[PDB]
Amino acid sequence: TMQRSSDVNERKLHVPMVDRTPEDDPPPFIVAVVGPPGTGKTTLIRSLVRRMTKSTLNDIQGPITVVSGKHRRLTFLECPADDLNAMIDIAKIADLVLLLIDGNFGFEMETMEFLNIAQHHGMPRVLGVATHLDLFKSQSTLRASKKRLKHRFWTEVYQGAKLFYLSGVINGRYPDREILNLSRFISVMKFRPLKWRNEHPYMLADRFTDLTHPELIETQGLQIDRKVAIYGYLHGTPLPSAPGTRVHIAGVGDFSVAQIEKLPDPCPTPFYQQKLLIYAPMS
Amino acid sequence: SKTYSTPKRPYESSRLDAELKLAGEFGLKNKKEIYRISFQLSKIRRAARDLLTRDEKDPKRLFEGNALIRRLVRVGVLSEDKKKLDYVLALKVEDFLERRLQTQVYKLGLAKSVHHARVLITQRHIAVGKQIVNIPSFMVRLDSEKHIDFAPTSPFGGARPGRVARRNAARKAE
């Protein structure tokens, strides 16, 4: 089997790429719950935060940064399922995508458009979550829908991807066994380098304040192009600290930075580096 | 197991016309059916060649040849008069696959074509005495050749008429 021994170690050899993800303060890997309207997202977010920090979250909004495991943390984002103007830049920023399908309906064209946008703009780690298995007692049809969805999904994304199935919701949160065997996977995540997120300094905003003078807006009369503080969390290549950098935030057009400032970290490092925990802003 | 075997060459003109004639004559599905019947024919007459090449009056040749001809007359591919061992050597694939249930119910009648025979006995209508057989490749034994009739729980026998007939009776009696 020397031919197989020389033929299966060609899986290793790829294009050499560079990473720039330093091993001292790795960012929360932004994952992005996206899919159809209605099904999934908010209850899956509530289940993941209830199993990762043992505390519920009612009326969630905006990006959370929860902690999972010892070293590193991660970031959730309920992307709205009605606009490509959020779907596109979520697929441009995201690193994992736990992607919702509903098995009593087949696929849906919002997750179709999301998977095509991801396939073009640079493949994140995709992971399918097939929810809504209120199908019937006919476990033959349950196995049939899961089999056809798995084969269609493995054609659409890489063949062999994980497709976690969820049953019905037990009073707001998902079945905790399935949330356990999903959370163990996204703790053993193992991401990959991509050229766009290793060539551009990119940041997801999670707090948004307007430090413009109230007397000034009250004497100008709702006309000014104000000044705005984005309290956020950068990923990727180092955003250069000198003010004057052109930074485009999405959906309004570009600006230049005025001043930036490093803050106390609102998420855990290891406690030995502390000496020598869900953080849910915009809420 | 590995019943069927690929022949000594599968891309050849005479073999291609062989499979074309046999398939279109006995109403067959693919080359695997001819290859299965041809294989087991080759196996039993390869076993018959050794019993021929050893001498007569050996107990091996005597009652193993009697065993082989009893099994072959039980399947029915050997006539009642040629009960000696070299007619097994002179066997052929045509009167060996002629005893399958498709061809046999077409010969018995009741089907009006070989292909209609195949599609009805896979639509579960023909029962050898008591047992409904829904498979063509049966090789029906000689004793149960006269027990072929439409099964009683099927509307070509004497059951309730089918769903097409009673649905048309409903929406033509409305």
Partner: protein, 74 residues
């Protein structure tokens, strides 16, 4: 007001030649190949087709004088 996916995106095929309803079921294609080749060799031999069916209406298709389809012994 809920979307769905259509047939070609569900099946994920496309840009193929027009294939054949005869080519679908192999038992049918190995029937419509035989009964053509059954009618092909009414043009290389003259096969037996029952015989004198009606009354003898003549040979009905032409007899020619200068033609001998008899294999001769060298």
């Amino acid at each position: 007001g809920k979307r769905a996916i259509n047939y070609q995106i569900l099946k994920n095929k496309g840009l193929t030649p027009k294939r054949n309803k005869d080519n679908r079921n192999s038992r049918v294609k190995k029937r419509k190949k035989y009964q053509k080749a059954q009618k092909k060799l009414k043009s290389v031999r003259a096969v037996y087709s029952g015989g004198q069916s009606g009354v003898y209406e003549g040979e009905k298709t032409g007899i020619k004088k200068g033609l001998t389809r008899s294999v001769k012994f060298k």
